[PDB]
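ZP: hey, is the calcium ion complex queued? I don't see it on the tracker
AM: it wasn't, my bad. submitting now with these inputs:
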Amino acid sequence: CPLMVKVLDAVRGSPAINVAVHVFRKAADDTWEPFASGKTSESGELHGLTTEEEFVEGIYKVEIDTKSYWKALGISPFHEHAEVVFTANDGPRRYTIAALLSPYSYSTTAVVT
Amino acid sequence: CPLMVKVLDAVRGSPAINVAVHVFRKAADDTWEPFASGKTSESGELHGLTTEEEFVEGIYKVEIDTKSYWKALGISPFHEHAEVVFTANDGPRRYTIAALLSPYSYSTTAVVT
Amino acid sequence: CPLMVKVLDAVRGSPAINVAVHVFRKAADDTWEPFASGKTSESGELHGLTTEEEFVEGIYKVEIDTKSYWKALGISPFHEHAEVVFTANDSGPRRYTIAALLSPYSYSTTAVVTNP
Amino acid sequence: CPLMVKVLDAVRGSPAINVAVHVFRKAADDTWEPFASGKTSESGELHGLTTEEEFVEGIYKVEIDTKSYWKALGISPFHEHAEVVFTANDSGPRRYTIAALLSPYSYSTTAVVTNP
Ligand SMILES: c1ccc2c(-c3cn[nH]c3)ccnc2c1
Ligand SMILES: c1ccc2c(-c3cn[nH]c3)ccnc2c1
Ligand SMILES: [Ca+2]
Ligand SMILES: [Ca+2]
């Protein structure tokens, strides 16, 4: 699957490989509870984060560790990370969170199908 | 595959389906010669444009018919089309031209692997 | 003006007007503390958030309330907000412009950093 | 200033300075004819391309020479240019700002259209 993340690199023109991604769900006390995590693959994709039964309606945060990514490439970055925060609302739906990274900018879109 | 195009819609949060795409190669006389064309699929992707033997080094233009796309959705658009112009340079390489559409803006990136 | 925010609307081809913006700064105990807030003008710009004296070194978060913007236009948007989190002034004072481009299911930000 | 161009660099977090910009207008015979050209300033802005009298209805193309920009910085870029093609002034005169954001393998443009 219900949740996939895809990351691209606008400087090198490539998938952003080996990027750490953590997903959190907002709790009743307004704190962020860990939900799923992983590293992007050689295609820049992170699959297998969750299952249909685990992924309920609510507010989610996808934190992408952009700073570590740029540093591993020897490139100087602006942001600490990228945080993408959205509501999941329930008919049949799959969500892709896509992000395009540059050192001083990022862009994100949602593909919901 | 060597050349793929992928199109997303930033307003609806979906693949951009049924978008006409024409590819041209620049000729010796500096005119644009037709090279390949097709319509994006239900995943927003256009595969099968060319073959390894046909796709040689040179300057290519990918013209995406964004105006017709928005009009078919009932949305008022700014651009006539989106034109993405690049050089192909030869080791082993596959090119993806990705575009993210909004009515008054578009973004494009290249994924070369 | 060491910190400025500029917001554009990619659907209408316009400045994004009356957008609320909240800035936080990380405290010594690693929590987010309020720092400044304001709203974009008719030009989509927000000036006056802070001063050279107040805008010290630190880790800052700029949260742009994109959800309320779209809802006010009668549109149900995907994201709760657009944001940037960054370390400021580590090599001395700088001027920062955060430029954001909005659609209902997408946003982009960029930083423009200049040395005064 | 009915037509303005503003360009930012997403790698350096800076205005994109000294960027050449060429504007064309479609002629009655459907070819592109030269209309105006200029280069971005130290702020990444280009003013003065045209006038209210000269900027009539038509189909315009704004070609931003991104290739030369990156090459000047010692970088080999993907695209030949960034562009916009649009019909202008169809419902009366408007003011147009073309805002571009550049990386070596990516670009974004947006239009800001206001009614004078
Ligand atoms: C943000 C996120 C995604 C992109 C894409 C893209 C199309 N397919 N997969 C990604 C293209 C251009 N700009 C983007 C900005
Ligand atoms: C505000 C918001 C965005 C920008 C951009 C930009 C173009 N595409 N992505 C963003 C360029 C130049 N000035 C801007 C001011
Ligand atoms: Ca310091
Ligand atoms: Ca008219």
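AM: back. The pocket of calcium ion (ligand 3) is lined by residues C 57, 90 (CB under 6 Å).
ZP: great, adding it to the tracker
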